[PDB]
Amino acid sequence: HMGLLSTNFDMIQALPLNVKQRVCALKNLQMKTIQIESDFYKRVHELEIEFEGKFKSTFDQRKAIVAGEVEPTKEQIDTPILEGLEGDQLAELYKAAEADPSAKGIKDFWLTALRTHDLVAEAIEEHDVPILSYLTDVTTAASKDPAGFKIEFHFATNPYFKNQVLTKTYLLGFDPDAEAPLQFDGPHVIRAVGDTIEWEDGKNVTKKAVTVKADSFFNFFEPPKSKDERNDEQAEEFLELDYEMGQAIRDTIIPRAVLFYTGELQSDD
Amino acid sequence: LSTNFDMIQALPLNVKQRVCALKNLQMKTIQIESDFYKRVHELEIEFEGKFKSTFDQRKAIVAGEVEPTKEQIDTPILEGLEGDQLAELYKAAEADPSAKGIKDFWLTALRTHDLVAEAIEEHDVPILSYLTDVTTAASKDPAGFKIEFHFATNPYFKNQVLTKTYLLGFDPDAEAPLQFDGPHVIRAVGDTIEWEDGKNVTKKAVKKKQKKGANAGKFLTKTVKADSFFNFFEPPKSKDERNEQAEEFLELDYEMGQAIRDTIIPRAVLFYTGELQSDD
Amino acid sequence: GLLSTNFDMIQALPLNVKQRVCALKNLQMKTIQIESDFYKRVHELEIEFEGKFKSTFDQRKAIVAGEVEPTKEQIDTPILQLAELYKAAEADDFWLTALRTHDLVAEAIEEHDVPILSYLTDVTTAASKDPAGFKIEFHFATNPYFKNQVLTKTYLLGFDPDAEAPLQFDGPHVIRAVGDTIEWEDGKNVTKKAVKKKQKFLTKTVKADSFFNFFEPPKSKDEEEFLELDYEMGQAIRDTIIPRAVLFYTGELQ
Amino acid sequence: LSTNFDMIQALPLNVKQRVCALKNLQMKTIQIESDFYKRVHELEIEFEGKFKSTFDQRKAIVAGEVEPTKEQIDTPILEGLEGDQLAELYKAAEADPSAKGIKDFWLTALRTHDLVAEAIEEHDVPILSYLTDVTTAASKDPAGFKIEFHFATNPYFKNQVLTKTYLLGFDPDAEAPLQFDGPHVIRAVGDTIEWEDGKNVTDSFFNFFEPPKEQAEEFLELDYEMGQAIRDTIIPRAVLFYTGELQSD
Amino acid sequence: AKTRSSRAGLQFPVGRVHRLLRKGNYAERVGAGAPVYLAAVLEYLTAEILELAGNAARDNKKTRIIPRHLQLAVRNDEELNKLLG
Amino acid sequence: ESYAIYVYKVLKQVHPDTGISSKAMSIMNSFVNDVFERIAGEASRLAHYNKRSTITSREIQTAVRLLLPGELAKHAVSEGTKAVTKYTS
């Protein structure tokens, strides 16, 4: 929160000017230390881009398993479906339901994973659920040239829209702002760019029937703007929450999708 | 912690084997994450030198070894103040020449952080007033990091520097392979405080009753652990070392060390002024 | 303990007599150790006599399995009117009947265990010295319920007084019991049963009543009367049923 | 009468001859068991000497002939008592030099055992107060055991020791071999008490030395059980009955 | 100690309770008094359950409160059973 | 979340030399978290009937009374009020 109302404000008020000016020097060096951190975060972003290819293979296999394209191996089968289960309990769970050959792959896998995460769950409304049942994969990739990252929602052939993939892009800034140089917590978002959904007829859940904007998860592809039309701080708050949800999908859900499917993970950590 | 458990129960064994296969693939992703975190650690070790200059200048200013420059003076002590308030704050106290440096600087910074604040007791305050600097550095070959509390010549102990090292593992735990969130702690190594006479605040004596003993219904004097911040240099033994409610204390020890290394040391003055308060 | 029937007397004894009583307790401990050695010797005697009983028990196994035919003297032994009883049926499950005749074992034998126990070719017992204990082997035949040729239940026993309760020695006690792993086939595990819960209904396999739970013994130190009852059933099989098996078959013992 | 009687009758009787063969083998097993019990009897006789030292030390301590040792003193008088209660109990009475050892030790031990308690009458208590020792020993050719009640100089009878012997059979019956459960009792032989004048209490416990040798066989069996209780339970753990911490049959 | 929770006599984390209340998006703003109150109430419930479960551990001659001890303590106390059951 | 350290402090305060298992401590953590969730949810509901959705000691108090049964509720309210009093002092 910073500013005044600083926990140790009365102390700094009582400090003689001698130390009051020394504290000012420490603030100046703190600004320099913040700048070094920004360079660090740029390096970490490049490191994420480097490892994208290393993670790609495992995520592609997950997509294959979810889509029923490939079958599990013996080693994969001898993996506990839920961690922390005794052999007796594991046997009970495996023998609690009989195999249905009709069910090809995991159904509603990404829908369930997204709705198990609290932040994303608050965005999913009832009319978006059947649409999200078609989510075959959710992928992310980070760029350095326009400084940002993207999240791609790969859908199947659905009676709601013709788009095969819906893309959400975030352009991010790694340098601290001059207004609040000491309030640097990592890369911030400069802007967000959504997608245009080729909705079928009468299926656009983002629009109400009163035509006015409705509440839907797919508004995620209609992000707020930074160079808005002056015809509005709520837009900035909306953009920050949109960025937070994008980070939740990119950094937490996609890396550990099954743990959200199994529900063994929640938003914290 | 198996949210959506009834669903997993209702899944046909056919889909259950696919979910377990996904868990195996999650283990593979975790291994790649472990390699990522190893690289990130090397990056921090690389940036140690870049941070050194600013941290050393801070240490010099706090100890009164150097005086602020014009650019340093024209930096607002409290960011976000109105000018009519900044001028009043500067003119609210007159300069005292006796005060050489910033006293209790590291004491104030450590006590403003919530987690560390819960560890500092009042009898620990005068000892922590001798804290000239707090530095941290990371190792790759033993795979860990250290926090060094530089003390001055004090009537509490003869130790010139109190060092706390954490040996941490970057590979997923065999116990909880899917619960990998980054490097975990293998064990923690404290220091031996050359306490003077009657100054050991980490240990006390209690006249307890060993009547709950062995053919001895008598009361005896026992040396019991006393509540102090310097018990930080007597870390909880790891699983291998000595053998409930000890892994939790060790994890809190690791959390406090991480708070000092990642949060307080990089932004110490922000905790001194209290403009930033983190918890965990 | 302090609730000793003659506690007021023991307190009323002068320190002079009380220290002498303490001496008697020490000598009692020595006597307890001598008894421990005695029981060890009796166990060694049982192991020695195992071989003496072995030949007769092997002949029993051969006769029960139809491997050998009886001799004239064997015919001339009363089965329990003799002519009427012998001539009552025209010519052409030993352990099942024998075990179900013993009351304690019978309470463990349920209906679904009867066809399984119809495969019992032999039941044998033997005692060990270095791993101080004994074992019971239920030798089964080729059965459509499990692949086990023999199901073994072992009891590890302690012949030395406990240091916690040194004066409470009553003979060898049971330290722990080790069962066996039954290679139950599919739908043949009589120790388990199915049940469901409200909502496709979710099936929940649950514990069932069977004699073969005898081969799933209670644990000793893991996180007690059940273990003692398991030991009692094992003692009944080893000491009473196996030595006089036909006497339980004929019903000549109550 | 046989529980599984219908089984033998409904049996095709071809295998019934096999059952008869098993009956013969059971007779053989019964004989082997008889030899086993004989060996156990020899083992008890062998262990008599091992128990002798401790039992004689008990006799000396009870009679005040010897004094307790430092190790002997540092044994809790009652098991399961902590240091507080143990010290308090020791501090409940002061040492009386007018007591020669344990008084009525064997009387108390015998009367704490349930079966023996039912035999002890009121007039037998002062007589049994002279019991220095109760010992037992087993024989092989007489095939049995004996219990000797060693008495002191008493104004009730001149017998120094009253002996009760049980002659036992370890061999299976030839007529009915299959009802063998171990050594049985053949007979019991008491002693002749040289009572003084007006002291013959014979309802009394000392009728135990006048053995009987449906109700008479029951008398012999209960007499044998009392003898076994004295031999196997009371004598081995006499002090446990003295303190009353053990009451068994 | 010197913590926000030490300024109310409580041994539960006032700061952590505040953070959880804000992070849970229960409302738009939360004052300082609500974390103090909530942490105090949770500390009281923890203390009462621990008291009953440790008394039960004593009645079972155990220095470690096993979960069965908490179960017996909860069932025996009618109010605790109404709250937790 | 985990209140294990604080639960342990409370345990040593109430019973000095008793201890708690790790599974019992998990049961205690679930108790504390469940009560937290119920009290916070009720506070949120009672704050919807307020302006700008601010949660003070009032909403927590009302939730405590509406959830905690009988004597427990009374004692909880007492200690909450005491704590807010000292925190303000």
Short mmCIF file of C-alpha atoms in Angstrom, two decimals, chain A residues 12 19 25-26 31 43 59 64 75 85 98 112 114 129 138 158 175-176 183 187 190 210 223 225 233 239 266:
data_model
loop_
_atom_site.label_atom_id
_atom_site.label_comp_id
_atom_site.label_asym_id
_atom_site.label_seq_id
_atom_site.Cartn_x
_atom_site.Cartn_y
_atom_site.Cartn_z
CA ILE A 12 10.55 8.02 10.77
CA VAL A 19 19.06 9.93 9.63
CA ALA A 25 19.95 7.78 0.36
CA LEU A 26 18.79 4.23 1.08
CA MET A 31 15.58 2.34 -6.77
CA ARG A 43 16.38 -12.98 -17.89
CA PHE A 59 2.01 -31.37 -22.77
CA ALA A 64 -3.19 -37.07 -26.82
CA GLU A 75 4.10 -47.79 -16.25
CA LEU A 85 -3.67 -43.58 -1.18
CA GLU A 98 -16.53 -50.62 -14.34
CA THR A 112 -13.12 -29.38 -14.83
CA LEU A 114 -10.48 -24.56 -15.07
CA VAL A 129 -20.07 -24.96 -19.31
CA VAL A 138 -5.06 -25.11 -23.51
CA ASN A 158 -18.72 -27.29 -31.62
CA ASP A 175 10.73 -1.90 -16.39
CA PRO A 176 9.50 -0.13 -13.24
CA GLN A 183 6.54 -0.63 -6.19
CA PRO A 187 6.62 -7.78 -15.00
CA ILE A 190 0.89 -3.22 -20.76
CA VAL A 210 -32.83 -7.30 -23.41
CA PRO A 223 -10.10 -7.65 -22.83
CA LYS A 225 -8.15 -1.41 -23.27
CA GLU A 233 -10.48 3.38 -13.77
CA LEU A 239 -7.55 -5.22 -17.10
CA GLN A 266 -6.21 -25.18 -5.39
#
